[PDB]
Amino acid sequence: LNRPNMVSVGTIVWLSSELMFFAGLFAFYFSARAQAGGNWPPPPTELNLYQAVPVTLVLIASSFTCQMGVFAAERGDIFGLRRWYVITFLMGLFFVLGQAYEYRNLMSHGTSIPSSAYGSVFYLATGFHGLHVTGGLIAFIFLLVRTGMSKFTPAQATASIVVSYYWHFVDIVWIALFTVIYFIR
Amino acid sequence: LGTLVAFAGGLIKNPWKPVVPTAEGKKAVLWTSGWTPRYQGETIYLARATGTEDGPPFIKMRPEDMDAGGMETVFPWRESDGDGTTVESHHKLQEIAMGIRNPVMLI
Amino acid sequence: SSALLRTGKQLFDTSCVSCHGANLQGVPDHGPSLIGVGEAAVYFQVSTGRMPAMAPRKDPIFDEAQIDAIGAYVQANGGGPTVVRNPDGSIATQSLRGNDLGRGGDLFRLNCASCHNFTGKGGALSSGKYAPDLAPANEQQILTAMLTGPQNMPKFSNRQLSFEAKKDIIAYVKVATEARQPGGYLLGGFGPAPEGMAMWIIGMVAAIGLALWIGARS
Amino acid sequence: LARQAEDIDTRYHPSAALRRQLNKVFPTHWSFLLGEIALYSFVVLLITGVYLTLFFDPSMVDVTYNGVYQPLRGVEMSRAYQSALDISFEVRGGLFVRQIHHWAALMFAAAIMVHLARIFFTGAFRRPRETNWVIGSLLLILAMFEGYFGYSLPDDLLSGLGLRAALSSITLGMPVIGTWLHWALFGGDFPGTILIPRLYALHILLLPGIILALIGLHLALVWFQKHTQFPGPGRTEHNVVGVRVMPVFAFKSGAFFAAIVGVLGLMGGLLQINPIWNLGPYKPSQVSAGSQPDFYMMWTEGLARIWPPWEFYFWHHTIPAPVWVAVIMGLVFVLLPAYPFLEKRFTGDYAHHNLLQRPRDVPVRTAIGAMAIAFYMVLTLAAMNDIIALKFHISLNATTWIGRIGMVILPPFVYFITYRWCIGLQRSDRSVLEHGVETGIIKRLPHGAYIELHQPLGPVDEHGHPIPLQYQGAPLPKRMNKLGSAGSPGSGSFLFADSAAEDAALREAGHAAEQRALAALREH
Ligand code: HEC
Ligand code: HEC
Ligand code: HEM
């Protein structure tokens, strides 16, 4: 019974709506970018390439570990699932501390939210991504707590899988944003 | 009854006895506010507060020193009080400062 | 200067003529005459974002030194209090700060604290308008606003209050708000009502959670 | 040690009474700990107050500060405020201790209010324990008055204004006696040289001692007369179900005391309370929006605020409005201990009861409780009008009118709503009694129907539909997971599983233990 899973399609359409939310955010950012000529970033701003790439590597490694957790998930093993999810949670927490440190460094040297338009749009674009990453960590915590309180059912596996490709979607949108910002400029 | 009456006798006071001297004899505290003249013709200035210790706590007030929407606080002066130099004058100034029914607005 | 002031006030018809008239006559329906107030009134009412509205604070409209032009225009039209300036061509910033604090604090608790607050936060008035918080206030605008007498605020003359009194008042205002509270997290500077709210929302919840954890339900 | 026990037994010969009390059994329920919290808070207040008394000086002679707080140097001020500033700033950790004291007092007030509410809801105020209810009412009134006297010793602008307004206006407003009481209390006019020492003495000596003695009396009464218990499987009106003292009861009490001290200390260290240094010394000429005193007598302030201005004028006399406020608060005081007599002479019930009733069973009492709590909440929130209009841009007059009209119109609405709510809860309980609890599973029934597949809770008829049960006033589960269906996952800790034999042994041992406990409770 129930050859497809309604949770799957529900999460798919929810991620679609969130993808359009990020579409709106990208629309805000790309607007007025061409309105400034030459050095369209303000000089009181210089992105640290030596610190942005490591967090991207962190996130892609976390996504790969999450996929390994999924592969453990479709079969009857909960403990490896918990181990992989804990590794992913720690990796994401390290990432979050990474952009927190970047945030502290950036405002300390001029540019702030009310300072320049470029700073405002960059801060707005990154803030929603950070909030969604924190929500994903909360989802990890809730799901891992739920696993150890009762028996194992296909519903638990479905929840794990939907959270997993929600995280994968987060990784994809983050790498797209990184390519937009640090490379195309 | 005798013991309880003796025990309760330490708190009873008359709120209607004349203790405060006035210009028409002596009146109870509740009927006075410190603005009552004391010898029928005293000159009392609407002195305003200053907040400084070296300078007098209250200084006299001139009509020109106001504005169309100015709010000020004044207190009775009683020139015989004097400025806050001697101990008696300072204590009298503090006494006139600590009065519930003393402060008056002038708008 | 004066011609540039006329350009920025009247020829910049976005600002002046729509409510007070080209000759600063003052249309009785909307606004006042605006003929006896000095440049200080304009400086305070413009630099603090209290710009024409449809009036809580907002972003300023004119900032690129044209506020000085507007002040010069209005002071030429009619006399009044003027902005206190630093002896170098700029506006005084720290020379206005005084030294005495006890007298300043006493004056604050005698005339300032009544509307604003004990600690300078927002205060509550009747029928709409209120008392704004003094946290976003800057000292020059503080002195100018006192000397100007804005809406619902008693106007204060330099004759009745000494200049040293203004220095002490602004010194106390800047000390009270900018100093770290030596009692941990602050709770808005109000009375014990937020304290009771915090007790009901935190102490009660944690206490009943610990009671449920320790106890059993049956 | 054996020798010490032998000597103690040979000297005082205590074994029997000690065995009697040590074998006492106490009921087990989370709602039964809402008095221990208040008692522990009381202990905290007592210890802190013992500490604070070593650095205070209650004198109203004017002095100069010349201490360490620069923005307050060279100002005429009361001695007591100087001592309070000394305790706050010039003693290592004194501010922490006084903040703990104030927070603990608020803890005490909230705990006593919650405990009274739970007692009123459970309906334990019947014939066997009416004097306990009267004593509790007296305790509440005395504690409220003591708390009012608490925040007034450091006579700042807030405390001075509050005490001035309340005491002076109410006492001077008395119709017949009036000025006599005020002059006796203050020794003349309002600002007296003896007021603060008298208040300090009353706050340290009389009220705390009376409160402690009455609390001991209440605890002794609840000790002798055995505690009630909720209805259950092995519960009856002639026995008490629970645990003994030695292995559980005292240990849980100590752990709860430690936890409550912990939360008090944490939240005291985190939250600033009553920053008197930010305030100023009390003077008659200084006043501002600073109002709304402590939140456990705030209802009196709200009642004073909302009351309409009615006055009477006859031959050279005048009765002001606040006399009505005094009448209302006196009637509220009177009604609190008189409620059980009214109930027992209204319903005509004179039967003993050792078993409580769940809140949804009795609609009328719950409706009256909702009446009272809604009235108290609307009165309390009315007094916070200024902050309402400040934080949220609302008209002050509009909010005052809203409170005034709501004090009359809201009570009947919530009364009717909670009556309907209780009736609906009873209906739902009857419905879940009639059929099996819903399992949340549907079946296709190839002929074309859909069924709930109720799980029966007991006997089943020949048709498969469980026979109706009877209501015994006992709670029943409304969710499948509440009863044992599928739980207790693998024996791993957080990352690594254990041996299968160990997990199976643990599972069977736990199931056997729970089944044995349930069988022993049900059969006996
Ligand atoms: C009607 C829209 C409107 C416009 C346009 C407007 N104001 Fe006002 N402002 C008011 C009104 C109305 C008042 C009267 C008092 C109040 O409402 O606070 C006022 C008050 C003032 C005050 C303080 C009160 C006083 O008597 O001086 C000053 C100064 C002032 N306006 C100057 C200006 C200046 C300078 C401009 C051009 C930048 C301007 N106004 C344009 C609305 C406006
Ligand atoms: C309730 C009567 C009242 C009194 C008393 C009063 N104020 Fe004001 N004041 C106001 C009102 C109302 C405003 C805001 C008006 C507006 O925003 O249009 C204001 C404005 C201010 C501002 C400007 C804040 C800002 O962000 O622009 C400061 C600073 C200030 N007051 C401080 C003081 C000082 C200093 C005193 C003592 C001289 C004082 N208040 C006494 C009514 C009062
Ligand atoms: C009976 C319950 C009590 C209540 C409701 C109560 C109420 C209060 C309150 C509200 C304060 C203000 C706290 C503060 O400002 O930080 C206070 C302070 C104080 N209380 Fe109590 N108190 C109680 C018991 C005691 C006891 C038993 C003592 C000791 C005899 C005591 C002595 C003090 C002292 C010395 C202070 C000064 C500390 C201060 O105000 O900062 N109190 N009390």
DSSP D179-232: HHHHHHHHSSSSS-SSHHHHHHHIIIIIHHHHHHHHHHHHHHHHHHSPP-B---
The H or E element spanning position D509 is helix D500-523
Residues in chain B: 107
3-state per-residue secondary structure call for chain C: CHHHHHHHHHHCCCCCHHHHCCCCCCCCCCCCCCCCCCHHHHHHHHHCCCCCCCCCCCCCCCCCCHHHHHHHHHHHHCCCCCCCECCCCCECCCCCCCCCCHHHHHHHHHHHCCCCCCCCCCECCCCCCCECCCCCCCHHHHHHHHHHCCCCCCCCCCCCCCHHHHHHHHHHHHHHHHCCCCCCECCCCCCCHHHHHHHHHHHHHHHHHHHHHHCCCC
DSSP conformation letters of D20-83: HHHT-EE---GGGGTTHHHHHHHHHHHHHHHHHGGG-----SEEE--SS-GGGTT-EEEHHHHH
> How far apart, in whole angstroms, are the C-alpha atoms of residue D280 and residue D156?
6
Long-range CB contacts (< 8 A, 24+ apart) of D48-51?
D48/D97, D48/D98, D48/D100, D48/D101, D48/D104, D49/D101, D49/D204, D49/D208, D51/D97
∠ CA D306-D308-D314 to the nearest 5 degrees? 145
Helices (H) and strands (E) in chain C, counts: 9, 0
Sheet of strand B46-49, all strands in order from the earlier edge strand to the far edge = B58-59, B46-49, B72-76, B104-106
Paired tokens of D517? 């406990």
Indicate the DSSP class of residue B76: E
Paired tokens of D400? 């005052």
* Cβ D203 vs Cβ D135: under 8 Å: no
Q: Which atom of ligand 3 is nearest to the CA of D108?
A: 5
Q: Taking the CB of residue D331, how many other CB atoms lie within 10 A of it?
A: 10
Paired tokens of B105? 């607005």
Indicate the DSSP class of residue B86: S
Nearest chain C alpha carbon to B52: C103
Indicate if the alpha-carbon torsion angle B59, B63, B64, B68 is positive or negative. positive
* Cβ A112 vs Cβ A119: under 8 Å: yes
**Residue C160: which of B52, B68, B70 has the nearest Cβ?**
B70
The residues after which chain A has a C–N gap greater than 2.5 Å are: none
Q: Taking the CB of residue C95, how many other CB atoms lie within 10 A of it?
A: 12
Instruction: Identify the CA nearest to D301 among candidates D158, D198, D191.
Output: D158
* Cβ D360 vs Cβ D426: under 8 Å: yes
∠ CA A35-A40-A46 to the nearest 5 degrees? 155
Q: Which atom of ligand 2 is nearest to the CA of C137?
A: 26
* Cβ A170 vs Cβ A88: under 8 Å: no
**Residue C101: which of D34, D73, D270 has the nearest Cβ?**
D73
User: Which residues, listed in sequence order, are joined to residue B42 by a DSSP beta bridge?
Assistant: none
CB-based burial, D233-264: b 16+ in 10 Å, e otherwise: eebeeeeebbeeeeeebeebbeebbebbbebb
**Residue D284: which of B15, B49, B99 has the nearest Cβ?**
B99
The residues after which chain D has a C–N gap greater than 2.5 Å are: none
Paired tokens of D379? 């009165």
User: Which residues, listed in sequence order, are joined to residue B25 by a DSSP beta bridge?
Assistant: B22
> How far apart, in whole angstroms, are the C-alpha atoms of residue C61 and residue C51?
7
* Cβ A95 vs Cβ A133: under 8 Å: yes
CB contact under 8 A, C210 and D395: no
Instruction: Identify the CA nearest to D118 among candidates D32, D224, D41.
Output: D32
> How far apart, in whole angstroms, are the C-alpha atoms of residue D112 and residue D105?
11
CB contact under 8 A, B53 and D74: yes
Residue identified by tokens 């074309």 is: D448
* Cβ D378 vs Cβ D360: under 8 Å: no
* Cβ A166 vs Cβ A136: under 8 Å: yes
Q: Taking the CB of residue C204, how many other CB atoms lie within 10 A of it?
A: 16
The H or E element spanning position B26 is strand B25-27
> How far apart, in whole angstroms, are the C-alpha atoms of residue D161 and residue D280?
12
Residue A107, classed as helix, strand or coil, is helix
> How far apart, in whole angstroms, are the C-alpha atoms of residue B13 and residue D188?
8
∠ CA B38-B39-B44 to the nearest 5 degrees? 65
∠ CA A61-A62-A65 to the nearest 5 degrees? 90
**Chain Cα centroid distance, residue C73:** 23
C164 Cβ neighbours under 8 A, 6+ residues apart: C98, C100
> How far apart, in whole angstroms, are the C-alpha atoms of residue D133 and residue B82?
63
Indicate if the alpha-carbon torsion angle C172, C175, C180, C182 is positive or negative. negative
Paired tokens of D185? 């209390």
> What's the alpha-carbon Rg for chain B, to the nearest Å?
19
Question: How many Å lie between the centroid of ligand 3 and the Cα of residue D300?
Answer: 21
* Cβ D211 vs Cβ D143: under 8 Å: yes
Question: How many Å lie between the centroid of ligand 3 and the Cα of residue D169?
Answer: 25
List CB contacts (< 8 A) between C105 and chain D.
Answer: 71-72, 75, 280
Residue B54 contacts C, CB cutoff 8 Å: no
> How far apart, in whole angstroms, are the C-alpha atoms of residue B86 and residue D396?
49
Instruction: Identify the CA nearest to A18 among candidates A135, A170, A159.
Output: A170
Residues in chain C: 218
Does the annotation list C116 as a binding residue? yes
Q: Taking the CB of residue D87, how many other CB atoms lie within 10 A of it?
A: 19
A&D contacts, CB < 8 Å: 24
Paired tokens of A30? 């790309």
Residue D99, classed as helix, strand or coil, is helix
> How far apart, in whole angstroms, are the C-alpha atoms of residue C38 and residue A102?
48
> How far apart, in whole angstroms, are the C-alpha atoms of residue A99 and residue D519?
58
Instruction: Name the closest-CA residue to atom 13, ligand 3.
Output: D102
> How far apart, in whole angstroms, are the C-alpha atoms of residue A132 and residue A140?
12
∠ CA D466-D470-D474 to the nearest 5 degrees? 115
* Cβ C194 vs Cβ D279: under 8 Å: no
Residue B52, classed as helix, strand or coil, is coil
> How far apart, in whole angstroms, are the C-alpha atoms of residue C45 and residue C30?
17
> How far apart, in whole angstroms, are the C-alpha atoms of residue A156 and residue B60?
84
Q: Taking the CB of residue D442, how many other CB atoms lie within 10 A of it?
A: 11
∠ CA C206-C207-C211 to the nearest 5 degrees? 115
* Cβ D386 vs Cβ D292: under 8 Å: yes
User: Which residues, listed in sequence order, are joined to residue D229 by a DSSP beta bridge?
Assistant: D355
Indicate if the alpha-carbon torsion angle D215, D220, D221, D222 is positive or negative. positive
> How far apart, in whole angstroms, are the C-alpha atoms of residue B54 and residue C141?
30
Ligand 3 contact, D46 CB (< 6 A): yes
Question: How many Å lie between the centroid of ligand 3 and the Cα of residue D200?
Answer: 9
Paired tokens of D216? 């001991």
> How far apart, in whole angstroms, are the C-alpha atoms of residue D437 and residue D428?
11
> How far apart, in whole angstroms, are the C-alpha atoms of residue D239 and residue D261?
35
> What's the alpha-carbon Rg for chain D, to the nearest Å?
30
DSSP conformation letters of D142-190: HHHHHHHHHTTSS-BHHHHHHHIIIIIHHHHT-SSSTHHHHHHHHSSSS
> How far apart, in whole angstroms, are the C-alpha atoms of residue D103 and residue D44?
10
DSSP conformation letters of D483-500: SSSS----S-SSS----H
> How far apart, in whole angstroms, are the C-alpha atoms of residue D64 and residue D67?
9
CB contact under 8 A, C149 and B49: no
The H or E element spanning position D239 is none
Q: Taking the CB of residue C96, how many other CB atoms lie within 10 A of it?
A: 19
> How far apart, in whole angstroms, are the C-alpha atoms of residue C148 and residue C111?
16
Indicate if the alpha-carbon torsion angle D363, D364, D368, D371 is positive or negative. positive
CB-based burial, A81-120: b 16+ in 10 Å, e otherwise: bbbbbbbbbebbbebbebbeeeeeebeeeebeeeebebbe
**Chain Cα centroid distance, residue D229:** 20
Residue C127, classed as helix, strand or coil, is coil
CB contact under 8 A, D490 and A82: no
**Residue A151: which of D489, D492, D494 has the nearest Cβ?**
D489
Instruction: Identify the CA nearest to C23 among candidates C37, C12, C9.
Output: C9
> How far apart, in whole angstroms, are the C-alpha atoms of residue C50 and residue C48?
6
Resolution (A): 4.5
Q: Taking the CB of residue C93, how many other CB atoms lie within 10 A of it?
A: 11
Indicate the DSSP class of residue D314: E
Look up residue A127 and give its amino acid: G
CB-based burial, D208-226: b 16+ in 10 Å, e otherwise: beebeebbeebeeeeeeee
> What's the alpha-carbon Rg for chain A, to the nearest Å?
19
CB-based burial, B68-86: b 16+ in 10 Å, e otherwise: eebebbbbbbbeebeebee
Ligand 1 contact, C42 CB (< 6 A): yes
> How far apart, in whole angstroms, are the C-alpha atoms of residue D481 and residue A153?
14
D79 Cβ neighbours under 8 A, 6+ residues apart: D57, D58, D59, D60, D61, D63
CB contact under 8 A, A149 and D494: no
User: Which residues, listed in sequence order, are joined to residue B21 by a DSSP beta bridge?
Assistant: B26
Experimental method: cryo-EM
Residues in chain D: 524
Look up residue A132 and give its amino acid: H
Indicate the DSSP class of residue A182: I
Paired tokens of D161? 């204004």
Task: Please report, to the nearest 10 degrees, the dihedral formed by the alpha carbons of residues A68, A69, A74, A76 taken in order.
Answer: 120
> What's the alpha-carbon Rg for chain C, to the nearest Å?
23
Look up residue D450 and give its amino acid: Y
> How far apart, in whole angstroms, are the C-alpha atoms of residue D282 and residue D191?
11
> How far apart, in whole angstroms, are the C-alpha atoms of residue A128 and residue A174?
11
Whole-number Cα distances in Å, D357 to C75, D125, D131, D360, D430: 80, 12, 20, 8, 16
Paired tokens of D78? 């009361």
> How far apart, in whole angstroms, are the C-alpha atoms of residue D422 and residue D370?
11
Look up residue C55 and give its amino acid: A
Phi, psi of A164 (to 5 degrees): -65, -50
H helix intervals, chain B = 2-8, 87-97
How many angstroms separate the most distant Cα atoms in chain A? 62
> How far apart, in whole angstroms, are the C-alpha atoms of residue A169 and residue A63?
10
User: Which residues, listed in sequence order, are joined to residue D318 by a DSSP beta bridge?
Assistant: D313
> How far apart, in whole angstroms, are the C-alpha atoms of residue D199 and residue D150?
9
Which residues between 85 and 114 in chain C have a beta carbon less than 8 angstroms from any beta carbon of chain D? 101-102, 104-106, 109-110, 113-114
* Cβ D161 vs Cβ D291: under 8 Å: yes
Residue identified by tokens 């599973």 is: D441
Quick one: angle between helices D94-122 and D250-270, nearest 10?
130
How many angstroms separate the most distant Cα atoms in chain B? 66
* Pocket-testing residue among C47, C59, C116, ligand 2, by greatest number of atoms within 8 A of Cβ: C116
